[PDB]
Write a protein that binds this ligand. Structure first.
Ligand SMILES: *[B]([O])([O])[C]([C][C]([C])[C])[N]C(=O)[C]([C]C1=[C][C]=[C][C]=[C]1)[N]C(=O)C1=[C]N=[C][C]=N1
Ligand SMILES: *[B]([O])([O])[C]([C][C]([C])[C])[N]C(=O)[C]([C]C1=[C][C]=[C][C]=[C]1)[N]C(=O)C1=[C]N=[C][C]=N1
Ligand SMILES: *[B]([O])([O])[C]([C][C]([C])[C])[N]C(=O)[C]([C]C1=[C][C]=[C][C]=[C]1)[N]C(=O)C1=[C]N=[C][C]=N1
Ligand SMILES: *[B]([O])([O])[C]([C][C]([C])[C])[N]C(=O)[C]([C]C1=[C][C]=[C][C]=[C]1)[N]C(=O)C1=[C]N=[C][C]=N1
Ligand SMILES: [Cl-]
Ligand SMILES: [Cl-]
Ligand SMILES: [Mg+2]
Ligand SMILES: [Mg+2]
Ligand SMILES: [Mg+2]
Ligand SMILES: [Mg+2]
Ligand SMILES: [Mg+2]
Lengths: 195, 226, 222, 196, 204, 233, 212, 195, 196
């Protein structure tokens, strides 16, 4: 799929992901949610080749949910991101690699800090204040370099995110049919229904 | 790379230059191309550096275990056979081109090995990108019944021809002499005809020239007591 | 298939002083892993106090230099023996290079001399004619080795003044001819160590108001 | 490479040049292409040096193990072991081999094994890049039941011409004589065979 | 396409008088796009330091692999691994992936705890050891680094002087490479103290 | 664009105290076939220049005709054709170099490597190389093809730099050339035993030697070489 | 390369970077990517250095010939169309050019034409061209208004190049600023990114990601 | 460029053409007019390879304007379309062909009839009640097959055109930034400024 | 194709097989590859039938026009006209031609012109795909100043072997004798030359 964004503010992580699903010359769907809840305080968005994206996301989801039941404990975002990275690093030298890029946004309940991880299909992990995959970063990183300040509120983060989406809607050729925005904080994961 | 091997009266000598290259860049100026398979069996290697090192270590390891198993000093033909069969199996993909030499209870021996696993016998041999320059010298100056002193001279001269005329070869000349009834003498940097001249200027900077943002002590020690 | 291009190796270096300019180049000429010549001149006096070198494919290099020397000759005939200024020479060379835009001279060209105010000048070219005046430029095979050293030791890049810690830069004091020749010699000695196509000899042409002087130095022959 | 094996009254003689080439560079000017797989069963090697050596080494192993169990093998048996290796690995091998041997019962025999892995029993055989230039000469000059001296001259003259015209062939002319008397090695240098 | 120049980056190491220095840039990118300016390429296992350039996923993977192996080494041997021994371990580990290699350019640096002797080493992607007396270079600006080191370097430099030399070697080499820069780190290593310095450099 | 068909191998040469020496074998190869055994690849121009040519023989014959025609053209309306206005090595070379570079620039090269050896009017030694790409260079020793790899190393041991030229006599220089030709016969698979050698001296003039042979070869040690490793018989 | 130009109340702002590369090798940090065609016409350059220099230098000769013949300065439309018609003749041959022809005339007012080696010719208010154009667009679009002061517009152009110089690996070196008005263009200095970045970071409070 | 549409109603011809100009990953312009007036009662829209489109359109424009001055007379749409076709048919066997597709909408003052001609880069001319070039027809022809009637008014034609644009905006992947609509009738050519 | 020309005491004799092939199909089994460019200047043709015919036709035209102006041309002159066509059109031609002629002054002469377009004056010459197999035989059996009967036997035996081994060669052996006496055509059928 196309555009996935992430931004870590003072007390939360905000992920924005496009709703369009295009196969060929037709937009088959305009309300697609390109994300899966891995645990109550950890969310993963994804983009890449058709089929691989969902198959990988759900596979990761199942593994984290299994860990949660076994230990009766939620893994830290750092731990989940490392697990995800290893799966992709394993995958890249397989017969048929997973062609999937992901953002992992989570709130660490131990350290009381929001955390955003950017991982590509090769298994390249980086922790960032803001991140993007595909052609999205070519427009959005310059905006975020200017406006982002680390001590921002969640409302300020959403405004800064609106400014990113507006730029994408202006300058990108593909109609990505808007974005679904989700916030990850101490209280868990929730969806902003109006954006 | 220029590597040579020369037979003489009571043994055999091998030699090599010390240049390693990645494209047109010199990766290592003082590379060690003479490898020890066993105490009195040494070989010079050309081609892919990791391959010549790895294939020598592996066969050298198995030769040592074989020597202990049989209670005998290892033979050059054993190293030759083990090397060629290994290289043949990998169909030339292991880029090791070797000049194998040594002394053993059967006598003194000199062989070459190519990456595809073919072996050759000779009184004088040369391999590598500078083998043509070296072979020109060998073909001009070699004779039967060479002494130890004459063979070392001929071998090092053949390497020098490679050093000066071949861009793939350079720097220093390494030699290893393996004489019958004696310890093999490994002459590391036997010749050093390429020392760099004194620089015109010293580029030692005044302290504080570089701009720094942060400093910190790194904890290398273990977790401490008390 | 026939390949009309080749690579003869070598490396060249131009440095502009306050009232002088130098154009240096090694004397080695190669193909693949063989040496053709240990002394094959590469930097040429082209008249009108201009020195030139076209490094890369030697056949194209010789052709270009030959054509520029020719251009200087006809400039005198057509314009009453007027001296061809370094800026005018540079523009002329652009048209020589771009004239073969779709079958290029495979060379990196550098010229050196004095501008019309008497100050040292170095101009640098890409194969298809793009050019730019510079205080400092290395060209050819070992250009990637030498240029960073020159950014540091000629333009004082990444250098600051002690005590201030990154606040005050090192002042851009001018360099004498004796100081420049030291940097040229060390540049080529360093390049010779790590680049196989560089060595044998170093030939430097120094340009002043008095004329064009030459200096030669031995380099490692391995 | 110019190689040949010729049967005659007293047995069989193998012959070969001594040149090994990497393109136009002569990697070895004194190569021994006549190699022993058993006491009186030898072979001439052409094509890849690595392939033919690896094959010959395997055959020598098989015939050594054959001898320990079943006694001396026939020349036909040796040719069959060569064939099995060349045929079954035809996709990965470049080996043109002539097998020649002497029994007391069968006397001198020659088997040629080209690239495909087929076997051909012949009175005499020629192979290698240089053989092309002497098909005419060898066909016209070969006779059955020649003497030792005649057969040596036939091989010497034949390989001399093959060497003269083929760039991939050269050096010395090596020969190996196989008879009831035993095994004799012969060598002939450029000054001798070029003036023929 | 070329794995060794997708992410970009550089590492350099130098020897001094009773000391060694290892330095790296901080850039991680996707070809033209700069992604991260905090991607450190130098790691350490006990007193042995390892710098790794090349494909970033393999940089991370190998760090995790050598942490794994040096920890097991320490438990069994009851002592920290030395630079000479670690160099062999890196070479062995890389060569076992001979025909499916990690696309990396490792660099080892450290001081032998028993002999006190300074040690540096470099490797190609399949394990070949380059054990230099003076300096080791690696990464997308290796040509540039060779030129800087070969001119600036002199033997037996004091720790505080050595810092200036290696820093100027890295900075000026990085500034002539599009895929290197975005910050830099320099480790100065002595027998029983290690100082880490972040350098101020141009951010383009 | 073409491919070379009938080809000539190495041409080798060097300077000595009073002149220059040049040599080349008499073979015209047709791929791996050693087709033509009587080909002269050293072509004299006047009594002061010898042009040695390797590579495509059909193109060599074309160049041979161009030089023959150059002598004819120089004689036209020239009373000093056999004196002050005679053809110099430098004139002959520059002409060829012009042609070679022009032909490569039309993507239709003369598939050759050429060495022009001679002595100038003022007694100076002339030795310069040019090939199908129009690339030119001069050196105390010059060689083409395999000669570059095997002959130059041997010849450079005699004359390593410019200052070694006055110290090198014609006997020492000729000895080195003849030895180099032997080495090439040992190791070049497209060479022949028969060769031609030319000396251009500032005192004794042009000496052209035909029908030379490689002699004093070492082959006896071949008898002791058996098998490829383990074989004893 | 990152080059931009935008129309506003006080005329036109033109801003460019200074970097030139050959693969990953940084060939130059001091390249002049604004070409002074005449006292009222500017040309930006992106793509092939030689193609751009040669033909925009050539363009100036054609514009000078126009005003000699017509006793009147060439229009921005006519100047841009001379270049676009020229490169169109060479279409398919492999020229690599992306340019903005920026200038002011009485009949047109402040005008910008984007001209490209595929033959594209577009009039417009805002343009960003080069490998780092997307980064420049991000800053420019979010802060652009018609009613900007000369001082604020100049900073926005400077800041937009800085943004691209930071993120785009093939952009950097320094920022050249120009301001085109009724009375011609005005140069506003070379600004080294190595000093400009830290200055902007501190004063603006931006680039909080980077450590300084 | 991307999408160009045409529809011939009772007494006029309506052409709609997208405003977007996309080079690579950026939309450089969102107000581009992809048409040229050939004569007072003849309009030509165009789409194809960059550079070729405008160069061809203006070349045709110049030739028709030349004819108009010479004869003091306006050519019929049929005559102009035939001229255009021949130029493209000539072009397709040239060294470098014009890579341009066009629609020619005109009002014949002699016959008092609107006329729409669709011509591709090969020189393939067809007279149609409604037409399209590129991927546009794959969506719009089915709608027009259903709704179009030959006696529609101009206002009904614009409504039917809005229904086409809405479908394109829903199902096509590329954001073509809306369309410029122009009407060709007995009174000449005019632009609908609000659409 | 197997073609050859041989000088001898009284003049020169040209020889050739008669096979033309499209792959493995014999398109013509009775081809005449010995063709006349002048009264006593003939040529042997190998390679492309179309190319060698077109060349030979052009040469015959040039020598006919030469004769009208300057009298009888030399064999060297004929070879030069062949060369000029083969050399200047080397990229587009596949022609291996042997030129042979008889003057009273120069007697029998043979010039061979291979693919490149080079010229080589020789005592005798062999060419075509089948020549490879008789380099050995011809080198060993050729003598200078042979008689007519000896030269006919030399060519007959040589081409017989070339035919025997080369698939592209076959049919009858055509020969053309060039002497002061005149021009004589000879033919030899399979039953005659195969049993040799
Ligand atoms: B010599 O030139 O053959 C030399 C001998 C080697 C065994 C020490 N070989 C090399 O230096 C090779 C050349 C080479 C380059 C590329 C592919 C294969 C071979 N160099 C290396 O193996 C090498 C290059 N960079 C770092 C380490 N090793
Ligand atoms: B002969 O030319 O066939 C010869 C026989 C070999 C057993 C010594 N073969 C080679 O010389 C081959 C190449 C070749 C040449 C001509 C025909 C077929 C094959 N050479 C090698 O195998 C070789 C060369 N250099 C190093 C190692 N091996
Ligand atoms: B810019 O990146 O387009 C820049 C502008 C040019 C006027 C200096 N171009 C270049 O740096 C190009 C490479 C390139 C990079 C990215 C996109 C397109 C092109 N370099 C050159 O033209 C060049 C010329 N001479 C020497 C080195 N590089
Ligand atoms: B001979 O085999 O070279 C022969 C000589 C020709 C002049 C009669 N040539 C051919 O038979 C050629 C093909 C060929 C075979 C072998 C080597 C080179 C060329 N055949 C033709 O030209 C031909 C075949 N069928 C119809 C027309 N022409
Ligand atoms: Cl062998
Ligand atoms: Cl015919
Ligand atoms: Mg050397
Ligand atoms: Mg940048
Ligand atoms: Mg124009
Ligand atoms: Mg149509
Ligand atoms: Mg037949």
């Amino acid at each position: 799929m196309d555009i996935i964004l992430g931004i870590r503010v003072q007390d939360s992580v905000i992920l924005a992901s496009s709703k369009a699903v295009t196969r060929g010359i037709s937009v088959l769907k305009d309300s697609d949610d390109k994300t899966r809840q891995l645990s109550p305080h950890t969310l993963m968005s994804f983009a890449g080749e058709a089929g691989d994206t969902v198959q990988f996301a759900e596979y990761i989801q199942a593994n984290i949910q299994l860990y949660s039941i076994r230990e009766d404990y939620e893994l830290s975002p750092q731990a989940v991101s490392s697990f995800v990275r290893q799966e992709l690093a394993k995958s890249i030298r397989s017969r048929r690699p997973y062609q999937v890029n992901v953002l992992i946004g989570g709130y660490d309940k131990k350290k009381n800090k929001p955390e955003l991880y950017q991982i590509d299909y090769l298994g390249t992990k980086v922790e960032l204040p803001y991140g993007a995959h595909g052609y999205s970063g070519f427009y959005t990183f310059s905006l975020l370099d200017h406006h982002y300040r680390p001590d921002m509120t969640t409302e300020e983060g959403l405004d800064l995110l609106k400014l990113c989406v507006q730029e994408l809607e202006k300058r990108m050729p593909m109609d990505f049919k808007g974005v679904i925005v989700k916030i990850v904080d101490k209280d868990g994961i929730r969806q902003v229904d109006d954006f | 790379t220029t590597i040579v091997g020369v037979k003489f009266n009571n043994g055999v000598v091998i030699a090599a230059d010390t240049r390693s290259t990645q494209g047109p860049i010199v990766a290592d100026k003082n590379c060690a191309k003479l490898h020890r398979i066993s105490p009195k069996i040494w070989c010079a290697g050309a081609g892919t550096a990791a391959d010549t090192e790895a294939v020598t270590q592996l066969i050298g390891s198995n030769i040592e275990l074989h020597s202990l198993y049989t209670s005998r000093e290892p033979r050059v033909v054993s190293a030759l056979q083990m090397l060629k069969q290994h290289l043949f199996k990998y169909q030339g993909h292991i880029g090791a081109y070797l000049i194998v030499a040594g002394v053993d209870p059967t006598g003194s021996h000199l062989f070459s090995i190519h990456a595809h696993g073919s072996t050759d016998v000779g009184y004088y041999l040369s391999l590598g990108s500078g083998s043509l320059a070296a072979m020109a010298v060998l073909e001009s100056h070699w004779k039967q019944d060479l002494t130890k002193e004459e063979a070392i001279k001929l071998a090092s001269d053949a390497i020098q021809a490679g050093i000066w005329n071949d861009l793939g070869s350079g720097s220093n000349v390494d030699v290893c002499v393996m004489e019958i009834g004696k310890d093999a003498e490994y002459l590391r940097n036997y010749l050093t005809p390429n020392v760099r001249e004194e620089k015109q200027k010293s580029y030692k900077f005044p302290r504080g020239t570089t701009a720094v943002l942060k400093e910190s002590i790194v904890n290398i020690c273990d977790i401490q007591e008390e | 298939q026939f390949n009309p291009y080749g690579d003869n190796g070598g490396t060249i270096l131009g440095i502009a002083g306050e009232d002088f300019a130098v154009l240096a180049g090694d004397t080695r000429n190669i193909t693949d892993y063989s040496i053709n010549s240990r002394y094959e001149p590469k930097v040429f006096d082209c008249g009108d106090n201009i020195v030139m070198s076209a490094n890369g494919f030697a056949a194209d290099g010789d052709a270009l230099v030959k054509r520029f020397k020719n251009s200087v000759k006809w400039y005198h005939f057509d314009h009453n023996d007027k001296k061809l200024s370094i800026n005018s020479a540079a523009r002329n060379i652009q048209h020589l290079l771009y004239g073969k835009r779709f079958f290029p001279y495979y060379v990196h060209t550098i010229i050196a001399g004095l501008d019309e105010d008497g100050k040292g000048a170095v101009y640098s070219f890409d194969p298809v004619g793009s050019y730019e005046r510079e205080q400092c430029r290395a060209g050819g095979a070992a250009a990637s080795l030498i240029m960073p050293f020159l950014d540091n030791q000629v333009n004082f890049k990444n250098q600051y003044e002690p005590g201030t810690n990154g606040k005050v830069k090192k002042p851009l004091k001018y360099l004498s001819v004796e100081e420049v020749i030291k940097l040229v010699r060390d540049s080529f000695t360093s390049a010779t160590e790590r680049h196989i196509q560089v060595g044998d000899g170093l030939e430097i042409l120094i340009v002043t108001k008095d004329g064009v002087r030459k200096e030669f130095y031995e380099l490692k022959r391995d | 490479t110019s190689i040949m094996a010729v049967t005659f009254k007293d047995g069989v003689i193998l012959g070969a040049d001594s040149r090994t080439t990497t393109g136009a560079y002569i990697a070895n000017r004194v190569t021994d292409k006549l190699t022993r797989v058993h006491d009186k069963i030898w072979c001439c090697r052409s094509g890849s040096a690595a392939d033919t050596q690896a094959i010959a080494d395997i055959v020598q192993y098989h015939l050594e193990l054959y001898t320990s169990q079943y006694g001396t093998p026939s020349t036909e048996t040796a040719a069959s072991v060569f064939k099995e290796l060349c045929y079954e690995n035809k996709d990965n091998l470049t080996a043109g081999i002539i097998v020649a041997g002497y029994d007391d019962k069968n006397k001198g025999e020659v088997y040629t094994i080209p690239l495909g892995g087929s076997v051909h029993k012949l009175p005499y055989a020629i192979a290698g890049s240089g053989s092309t230039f002497i098909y005419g000469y060898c066909d016209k000059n070969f006779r059955e039941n020649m003497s030792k001296e005649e057969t040596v001259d036939f091989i010497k003259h034949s390989l001399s011409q093959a060497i003269k015209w083929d760039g991939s062939s050269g050096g010395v002319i090596r020969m190996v004589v196989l008879t009831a008397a035993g095994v004799e090695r012969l060598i002939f240098y450029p000054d001798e065979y070029e003036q023929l | 396409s070329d794995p060794s120049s997708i992410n970009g980056g550089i590492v350099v190491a130098m020897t001094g008088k009773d000391c060694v220095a290892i330095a790296c840039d901080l850039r991680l990118g996707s070809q033209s796009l700069g992604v991260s300016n905090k991607f450190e390429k130098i790691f350490h296992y006990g007193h042995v330091f390892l710098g790794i350039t090349g494909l970033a996923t393999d940089v991370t993977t190998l760090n995790e692999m050598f942490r794994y192996k040096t920890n097991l080494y320490k438990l069994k041997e009851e002592r920290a691994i030395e630079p000479e021994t670690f160099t062999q371990l890196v070479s062995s580990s890389l060569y076992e992936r001979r025909f499916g290699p990690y696309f990396v350019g490792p660099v080892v640096a450290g001081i032998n705890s028993k002999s006190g002797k300074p040690f540096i080493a470099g490797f190609d992607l399949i394990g070949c050891i380059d054990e230099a007396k003076d300096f080791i270079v690696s990464g997308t600006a290796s040509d540039q680094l060779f030129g800087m080191c070969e001119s600036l370097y002199e033997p037996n430099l004091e720790p505080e002087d050595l810092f200036e030399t290696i820093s100027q070697a890295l900075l000026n080499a990085a500034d002539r490479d599009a895929l290197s820069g975005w910050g830099a780190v320099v480790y100065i290593i002595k027998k029983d103290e290690v100082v880490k310095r972040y350098l101020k450099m141009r951010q383009d | 664009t073409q491919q070379p068909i009938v080809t000539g191998t190495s041409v080798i040469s060097m300077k000595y105290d009073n002149g220059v020496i040049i040599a080349a074998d008499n073979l015209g190869s047709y791929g791996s076939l050693l087709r033509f055994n009587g080909v002269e690849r050293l072509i004299p121009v006047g009594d002061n220049t010898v042009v040695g040519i390797s590579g495509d023989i059909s193109d060599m014959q074309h160049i041979e005709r161009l030089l023959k025609d150059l002598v004819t053209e120089n004689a036209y309306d020239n009373p000093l054709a056999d004196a002050e206005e005679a053809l110099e090595p430098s004139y002959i070379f520059e002409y060829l170099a012009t042609v070679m570079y022009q032909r490569r620039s039309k993507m239709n090269p003369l598939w050759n490597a050429i060495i022009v050896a001679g002595v100038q009017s003022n007694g100076d030694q002339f030795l310069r190389y040019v090939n199908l790409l129009g690339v030119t260079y001069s050196s105390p020793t010059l060689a083409t093809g395999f000669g570059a790899h095997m002959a130059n190393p041997l010849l450079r041991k005699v004359v390593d730099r410019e200052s070694d030229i006055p110290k090198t006599t014609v006997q020492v220089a000729e000895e080195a050339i003849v030895n180099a030709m032997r080495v090439l016969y040992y190791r070049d698979a497209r060479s022949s035993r028969n060769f031609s050698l030319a000396i251009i001296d500032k005192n004794t003039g042009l000496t052209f030697k035909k029908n030379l042979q490689v002699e004093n070869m070492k082959w006896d040690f071949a008898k002791d070489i058996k098998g490829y490793g383990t074989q004893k018989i | 390369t990152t080059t931009l130009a935008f129309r506003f109340q006080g005329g036109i702002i033109v801003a460019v970077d200074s970097r030139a590369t050959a693969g990953n090798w940084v060939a130059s940090q001091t390249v002049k990517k604004v070409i002074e065609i005449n006292p009222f016409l500017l040309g930006t350059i992106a793509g092939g250095a030689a193609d751009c220099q040669f033909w925009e230098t050539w363009l100036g000769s054609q514009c000078r010939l126009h005003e000699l013949r017509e006793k009147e300065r060439i229009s921005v439309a006519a100047a841009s169309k001379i270049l676009s018609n020229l490169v169109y003749q060479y279409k398919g041959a492999g020229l690599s050019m992306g340019t903005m022809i920026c200038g002011y005339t009485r009949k047109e007012g402040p005008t910008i034409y984007y001209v490209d080696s595929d033959g594209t010719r577009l009039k417009g208010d805002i343009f960003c061209v080069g490998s780092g154009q997307t980064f420049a667009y991000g800053v420019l679009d979010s802060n652009y208004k018609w009613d900007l002061s000369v001082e604020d517009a100049l900073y926005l152009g400077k800041r937009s190049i800085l943004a691209a110089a930071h993120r785009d690996a093939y952009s950097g070196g320094s920022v050249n600023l120009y301001h085109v008005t009724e009375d011609g263009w005005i140069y506003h200095g070379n600004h080294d990114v190595g000093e400009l970045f830290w200055k902007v970071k501190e004063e603006e409070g931006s680039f909080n990601n980077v450590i300084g």
